[PDB]
Amino acid sequence: PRPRILICEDDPDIARLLNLMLEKGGFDSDMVHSAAQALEQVARRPYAAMTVDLNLPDQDGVSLIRALRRDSRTRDLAIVVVSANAREGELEFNSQPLAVSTWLEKPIDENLLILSLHRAIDNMA
């Protein structure tokens, strides 16, 4: 519908699942499959938030998030991690500078996903 989410996910099936779940929750979204694509695409247009897979091919998810926080135009972009090793990733790298609103595991809790994005967007705003 309106607020647009940038989905960065390595797995085609999961990228499409997120695209479809987000639509049910009132969100438009774009799917990309790598950190490089995410960096390029995030600048091409306004995004309310990004979902990040920790296990990416090129650069891993935390590397992508760090890069985004070091750029003024994406320092306030709400980010939600959706990954298989989300919990251990959070325990190891989470920090205020990283500013990741929520770390979600797979299988994905749809309700928590939509709730978390709404929360993340409003808190960053």
Which residue in 38, 101, 96, 106 sits closest to 67, CA to CA? 38
- Give the number of domains in the chain: 1
Token pair of 111 as six digits: 């309700």
Handedness of CA 92, 57, 50, 124 (dihedral sign): positive
What is residue 85's three-state secondary structure? coil
CA dist 32 and 7 (Å) reads 6
Q: How do strand 28-32 and strand 4-8 relate by DSSP bridges?
A: parallel
Could you tell me the resolution of this structure in angstroms?
A: 2.2
CA dist 16 and 25 (Å) reads 14
CA dist 110 and 38 (Å) reads 22
Specify which residues 103 forms β-bridges with: 81
CA dist 30 and 6 (Å) reads 5
Task: Give the domain CATH number at 7.
Answer: 3.40.50.2300
| Domain that residue 67 falls in | 1-125
- CA dist 46 to 3, 13, 63, 65, 99, Å? 9, 25, 21, 17, 19
What is residue 95's three-state secondary structure? coil
CA dist 9 and 12 (Å) reads 7
Q: How many CB atoms lie within 10 A of CB 117?
A: 26
- Helices 86-93 and 61-69: angle between axes, nearest 10 degrees: 50
CA dist 3 and 52 (Å) reads 17
CA dist 90 and 82 (Å) reads 11
Which residues, 6 or more positions from 32, have their beta carbon under 8 angstroms from its beta carbon?
6, 7, 8, 9, 38, 41
Torsion from C-alpha of 73, 22, 123, 33, nearest 10 degrees = -40
Q: Convert 11-47 to b/e letters by CB count within 10 Å (16 or more is b).
A: eeebbebbbebbeebebebbbbbbbebbbebbeeeeb
